[PDB]
């Protein structure tokens, strides 16, 4: 009975959400039908009418003129690099052995 009540509550909440969505859709439809043209005519009849920018333009011009990049990656430990190399070599050896066998 608790599970059935849960199912019923879920269905009721879904129905409420669907009703709200339908209401919102109807409102949006009425808006796009009338208020769209209204606001369009109103906006057509209406009217609605630098140091950082200068520095940015100067910097952009400078960067376009000259460029010097050297994004070197972080150097790992020598022991870690040796371990990685050994792992790669061991993987290669195991692959070769697997090729020789199967």
């Amino acid at each position: 009975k608790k599970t059935k009540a849960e199912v019923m509550k879920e269905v009721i909440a879904k129905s409420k959400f669907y009703k709200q969505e339908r209401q919102k859709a109807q409102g949006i439809m009425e808006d796009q039908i009338d208020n769209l043209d209204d606001n369009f005519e109103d906006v057509m009849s209406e009217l609605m009418m630098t140091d950082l920018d200068k520095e940015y333009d100067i910097k952009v011009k400078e960067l376009q003129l000259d460029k010097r990049a050297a994004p070197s990656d972080r150097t790992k430990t020598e022991e870690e690099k040796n371990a990685e190399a050994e792992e790669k070599k061991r993987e290669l050896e195991q692959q070769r052995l697997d090729r020789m066998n199967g």
Binding site: K24, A25, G27, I28, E30, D31, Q32, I33, D34, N35, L36, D37, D38, N39, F40, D42, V43, M44, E46, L47, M48, M49, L52, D53, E55, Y56, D57, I58, K59, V60, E62, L63, Q64, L65, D66, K67, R68, A69, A70, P71, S72
Partner: protein, 261 residues
């Protein structure tokens, strides 16, 4: 004074945008970007009450349709107000995914981000959480290298601040094109941050944060070849004056082993 039909249409469009989170946009929102009085249309529609997905869709439509200066002004106003409202409403100062998508669209708009949005937030003095969110957004999505170097040189020419320092750290992590003038602006920022033993300064003798220390470490690791011999000596003097314990050693090693321009 706007007309009664104008006010009713704008209020209905604002209510529809507030009540809608998915689906299709209305013809009012589809024809609002084709007019010239978009600022007055938005002021009558009151976009400070819409939802995050609606704000993201409006920002995407503005970046797709509108022009440079109008898009910059609208993006500045709407994005600053919505980001401040979201950061105030979130008790832990967290951002929304649709707000992050709208910020990504406003950053893809090149003129609307640095001249309109990023400069106004730094001028309004965003907090450390907002500066970290902006740095995360700038590390996730990357704008053009010209606008990136422009924002970096602007934050270097501007005074010391938490948002400006976080922006400089994000720019040093992105590692865009650093020209001779951009490296000179970064060196001028470093010289204004370093102490002057006749006229001293608050930024000259103030304490720097760990974000500024990591920014200086990344700048010494990346743009060492953009600094000359005298600039490398000035960076070493700054690392001797206002250096650190663990991050400062790699910074001094990079400033001593880096090439010269």
């Amino acid at each position: 004074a706007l007309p009664e039909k104008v006010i009713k249409a704008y209020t209905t469009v604002g209510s529809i945008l507030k009540t809608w989170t998915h689906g299709k946009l209305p013809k009012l929102f589809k024809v609002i970007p084709s007019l010239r009085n978009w600022q007055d249309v938005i002021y009558v529609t009151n976009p400070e009450e819409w939802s995050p997905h609606v704000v993201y869709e409006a920002t995407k439509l503005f970046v797709s349709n509108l022009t440079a200066k109008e898009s910059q002004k609208f993006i500045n106003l709407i994005l600053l107000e919505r980001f401040r409202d979201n950061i105030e409403t979130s008790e832990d100062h967290s951002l929304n995914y649709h707000i992050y998508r709208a910020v990504k669209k406003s950053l893809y708009k090149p003129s609307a981000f640095f001249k309109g949005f990023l400069f106004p937030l730094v001028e309004t003095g965003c907090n450390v959480r907002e500066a970290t969110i902006a740095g995360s957004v700038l590390a996730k999505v990357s704008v053009p290298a010209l606008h990136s170097s422009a924002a970096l040189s602007y934050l270097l020419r501007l005074p010391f601040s938490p948002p400006t320092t976080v922006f400089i750290k994000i720019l040093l992590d992105k590692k865009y094109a650093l020209p001779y003038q951009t490296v000179d602006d970064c060196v001028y920022y470093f010289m204004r941050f370093r102490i002057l033993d006749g006229s001293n300064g608050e930024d000259a003798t103030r304490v720097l944060p760990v974000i500024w220390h990591k920014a200086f470490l990344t700048f010494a690791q990346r743009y060492k070849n953009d600094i000359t011999q005298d600039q490398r000596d000035f960076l070493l003097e700054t690392v001797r004056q206002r250096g650190h314990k663990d991050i400062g050693p790699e910074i001094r090693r990079e400033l001593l082993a880096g090439a010269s321009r």
